[PDB]
Design a protein around this ligand. Sequence first.
Ligand SMILES: *C(=O)C[C@@H]1O[C@@H](C)[C@@H](O)[C@@H](O)[C@@H]1O
Ligand SMILES: *C(=O)C[C@@H]1O[C@@H](C)[C@@H](O)[C@@H](O)[C@@H]1O
Ligand SMILES: *C(=O)C[C@@H]1O[C@@H](C)[C@@H](O)[C@@H](O)[C@@H]1O
Ligand SMILES: *C(=O)C[C@@H]1O[C@@H](C)[C@@H](O)[C@@H](O)[C@@H]1O
Lengths: 89, 89, 89
Amino acid sequence: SSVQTAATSWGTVPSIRVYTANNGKITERCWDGKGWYTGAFNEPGDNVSVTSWLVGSAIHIRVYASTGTTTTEWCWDGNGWTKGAYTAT
Amino acid sequence: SSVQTAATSWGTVPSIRVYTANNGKITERCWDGKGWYTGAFNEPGDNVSVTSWLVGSAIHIRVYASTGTTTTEWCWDGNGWTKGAYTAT
Amino acid sequence: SSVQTAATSWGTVPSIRVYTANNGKITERCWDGKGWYTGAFNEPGDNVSVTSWLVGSAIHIRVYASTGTTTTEWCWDGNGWTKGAYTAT
Ligand SMILES: *C(=O)C[C@@H]1O[C@@H](C)[C@@H](O)[C@@H](O)[C@@H]1O
Ligand SMILES: *C(=O)C[C@@H]1O[C@@H](C)[C@@H](O)[C@@H](O)[C@@H]1O
Ligand SMILES: *C(=O)C[C@@H]1O[C@@H](C)[C@@H](O)[C@@H](O)[C@@H]1O
Ligand SMILES: *C(=O)C[C@@H]1O[C@@H](C)[C@@H](O)[C@@H](O)[C@@H]1O
């Protein structure tokens, strides 16, 4: 009955994103070399995985948030957190 | 309760593999730029983790399926999924 | 229930670190091309995440060990496992 985390990172500084599902909410903590700051991501889910890739200098994050049998993909591409095409059927 | 996912990406397109443990079984959803489709991965498990890595253009995936204390490793290196040499002791 | 794992890789060889939470304790199993051994990492946690990044040849690993609402970051920077600056939202 502990919280459940997921992490990703990029570059050599580095930048780190740590997502934490606690009591059906997933929050984000962010490192870009100067301290941890609470991030923009806030979405429901008891379980969370993450991946990320660079395109040049631009990070792209995909956060998979599952409640029950329902996994929701949240997409960061530098313009906010939008919902992805991800489904499972 | 909730399903438990694990993701990895690679490239800049990118390619994304999203593994989902649901009711004791792990399956795989795949993105390579033109839509999600169900992958060939299909092995038992109540927990999943994943890592990948490129040797040039070739992708290499490692899936750590766990059921109780037993964590099996599944290897994709181009010609299908093979059980890997991982153990815990 | 079932044990829970996290994994990261680096290089072309590659090197793999598979972390495993089992009744409170998180242990590590390491691959560097010549088989699986047991790594130095040993910290308490009911759930673990991990990420890693290269800086030239030097690997850097962050392991997020959670127990209850409390998540602890462990840092590999080629000189051991030190406690990280991460705190929660
Ligand atoms: C500023 O806070 C932006 C920031 O970093 C983004 C990549 C993403 O993690 C966002 O949620 C976060 O708040
Ligand atoms: C829309 O712009 C595509 C988008 O990003 C992909 C990498 C994939 O995550 C897809 O689910 C998402 O909608
Ligand atoms: C030698 O044992 C070092 C080894 O690999 C490190 C990168 C880190 O994973 C450490 O815990 C492990 O023991
Ligand atoms: C140095 O930056 C401190 C250190 O490394 C960061 C990337 C992050 O993991 C931080 O919590 C850790 O203390």
